[PDB]
Design a protein around this nucleic acid. Sequence first.
RNA 1: GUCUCUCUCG
RNA 2: GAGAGAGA
Length: 463
Amino acid sequence: GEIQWVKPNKETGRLNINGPTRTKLEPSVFHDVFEGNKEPAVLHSKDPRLEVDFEQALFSKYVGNTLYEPDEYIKEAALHYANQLKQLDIDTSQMSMEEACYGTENLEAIDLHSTAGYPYSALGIKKRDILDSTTRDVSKMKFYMDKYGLDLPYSTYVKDELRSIDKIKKGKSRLIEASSLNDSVYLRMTFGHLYETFHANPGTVTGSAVGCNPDTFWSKLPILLPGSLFAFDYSGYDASLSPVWFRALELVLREIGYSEEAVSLVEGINHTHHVYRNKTYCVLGGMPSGMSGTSIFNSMINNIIIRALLIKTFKGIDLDELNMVAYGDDVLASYPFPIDCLELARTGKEYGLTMTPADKSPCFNEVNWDNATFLKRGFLPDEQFPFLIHPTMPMKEIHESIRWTKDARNTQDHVRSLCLLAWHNGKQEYEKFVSAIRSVPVGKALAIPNYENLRRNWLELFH
RNA sequence: GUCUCUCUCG
RNA sequence: GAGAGAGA
Ligand SMILES: [Zn+2]
């Protein structure tokens, strides 16, 4: 992805889009019970902790574009992935506006608390003024679709969240690039049925884990990914995507039967305009972060990428023996023989992709079930039923979370949520966690899940 | 102040 | 109907 131009909003006529510049994050009553280094992300150019120019740090993720047109490898990769999707029998017909707004069994209703985006946000119109759960009204939505149309700019907000000290000094805050309600509705009508298929079928046929619940999904993954594992990290995946990957996605959507009218929406993703503060800017390439379908299309593009990388770097790859699941840029894959990701990464750099080792070291070391991570969780067989796999979240991450709060009124829910993640690390580590929580007065006031009930609730998910 | 999952409360 | 947490 590459910024093509930046203009004042005076010159483009776009409304200003401003988000909060003060963090809601404050130290919690556990701030000194646990160790951690993270602090709230920089939200303002005048943050005293910055050691670089903030806005330049924010937009450095757009590293440029390399390829624009699919080569032979990307074409074969796209066709192989699309052929695989055919068995799912995706409904390529347009989803009704009423389903698209108010939801189906496998597609959540449009959230009425998340932004309506441009221009409704700037004008002061919330979604509750357009959409109504009770009435399932689509009349006003049709009106506003006609009034403001489509290809509206993406509203850019900085995300208020914890970050490591290094990312605070270098201003590497993360951006939400929120699509207008009109484009969301339009994308959900065009692809809502494919979204349903993906949400209902996380696994190695979609090649996607969007919609999975890790508590149950983890036990399927060693069976879905037989053989030798491979995985790696991307640096700035979404923003590094060149236009070739959107051309490749068009190839996939066409081959599984989408109308040219539907396929034509992809160029509106490849080429997007954004408003941040009082400026408009054009981005060519790059996936917007707050678009309807960001995770799914990121995941689909990843399926094309891994296939293309394999057949370009190695001779004799049989793609039918590849198994992979992606959640956006996060990937876990397997193949009958070990795959050298040092070579995959070399090829990836030609495509404009920066790929680093999974274990965060400088060397591409072996990935196996004892060290693999997906969605930030490891894989730990249950000691009693070894076919049941615990998703393990490192206590370090849980420790970072519990030391801060955006509203100490919600301390109980926050601590409970963390306990539901923590117990998978085992009884000893969990009770150590609970003991520390209970070492301060507020901790003695909280209802904390008992390990045995947690484990028994989990086992019952498998019936 | 994006989506997915999970939990909690009327 | 409202709130939170984590992940991407
Ligand atoms: Zn443009």
